[PDB]
């Protein structure tokens, strides 16, 4: 029962400080809560992002600091989504950068 599962990542978000930033979308896109401030870490690429500003979005910020993330790049990973269609809907559209 690892963080490769969206369900497990979502449960790490206990005591999430940001009411305006969606923990569900963060967990859905690879993030788990580190429990240090508002810092989250991606289980697939390892990027850690914190000190979020109200203009920041889950996927764009993730893509901004980690352009080659396997999950965001739509490569094969061991991720287990709660809802596959919802994940496909939120991941960055395909494109060769």
């Amino acid at each position: 029962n690892d963080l490769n599962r969206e369900e497990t990542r979502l449960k790490t978000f206990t005591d999430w400080p940001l009411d305006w930033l969606d923990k569900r979308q963060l967990a859905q896109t690879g993030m788990y809560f580190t429990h240090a401030g508002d810092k989250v870490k991606c289980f697939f690429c390892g990027v850690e992002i914190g000190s979020w500003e109200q203009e920041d979005q889950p996927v764009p910020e993730h893509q901004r600091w980690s352009p080659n993330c396997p999950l965001l790049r739509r490569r094969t990973t061991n991720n287990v989504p709660i809802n596959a269609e919802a994940l496909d809907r939120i991941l960055p559209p395909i494109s060769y950068d």
């Binding site: 810092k39 870490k41 690429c45 390892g46 990027v47 850690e48 992002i49 914190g50 000190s51 979020w52 500003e53 920041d56 910020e61 600091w65 980690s66 080659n68 993330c69």
Partner: peptide, 7 residues
């Protein structure tokens, strides 16, 4: 946001 760690 700030990246506390970049791959």
């Amino acid at each position: 946001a700030i990246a506390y760690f970049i791959p």
